[PDB]
Symmetry: C3
Amino acid sequence: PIFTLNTNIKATDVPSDFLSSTSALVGNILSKPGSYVAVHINTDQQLSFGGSTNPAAFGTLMSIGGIEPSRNRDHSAKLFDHLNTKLGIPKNRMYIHFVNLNGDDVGWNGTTF
Amino acid sequence: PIFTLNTNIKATDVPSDFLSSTSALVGNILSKPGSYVAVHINTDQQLSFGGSTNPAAFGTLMSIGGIEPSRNRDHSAKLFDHLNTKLGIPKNRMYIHFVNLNGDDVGWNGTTF
Amino acid sequence: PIFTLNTNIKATDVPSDFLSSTSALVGNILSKPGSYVAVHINTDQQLSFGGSTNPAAFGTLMSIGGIEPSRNRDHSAKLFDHLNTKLGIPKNRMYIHFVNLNGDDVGWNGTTF
């Protein structure tokens, strides 16, 4: 799995345990081993949400399986609570695109799944 | 909707009204309220187009379209003019991936559409 | 085509010819002219793989044609070999999402393809 986020907040405002806590949450919610979980946060970005440059973010959570309509609502509740808690960004100022990948479209270790 | 752009131009060359003006523009072409519009630009990126590192950019415009047409050609013309007039970037050196999102795959305010 | 990659390695650690050789390679594997190839690398990113911030990366390769289930494993072997050589990043610490694009949803110049 990959969780990638773009935000306008400052890097110094991302806690030291952000990558670990996010890696843990992503693996636990998608039921994937932590060794396959990648987390990325791009901070200090020029980003406007709803016409304001106040703290906001948008990102994507992609994974081969574990993601589908009948599950994204729960995924969202947990991820938004987590991000609001760690970065302090309001839940109505964040978007997350959930993507269910096909193994054949994902390269890893020089091969595909 | 979300409009995110990556480009190799300097951050200083981006107009201070870019975000506000791009946000209003996006809400217009997609006929979506500004309250749901997010705009993001990542500048100073190491980006080569056609083998040269001259001014160029690539991005995505995502929105939940549902039971509606495409209009990507009209969107691209209106968007490229905007980006070209505002950033001065050559239109033949910019790609824009148009993505029609399914509400169930989009997380917002701790829930999904 | 567009090959965009995010990595935690330092910007100066990216060889001056990375964009050049990568552009040539992408064009080669997809049988596409270099003039339509865009390569992007976002370095110095806060990114973990398996919870570790040791060298790692993830990216996307998108193209209107050339990307298909029957072709991506060969693309992967070639791209991972190239990235591991150029960037020194272990192959089991990189992900590449292969995306085949429809010309109808790709903006260039001022219209689509």
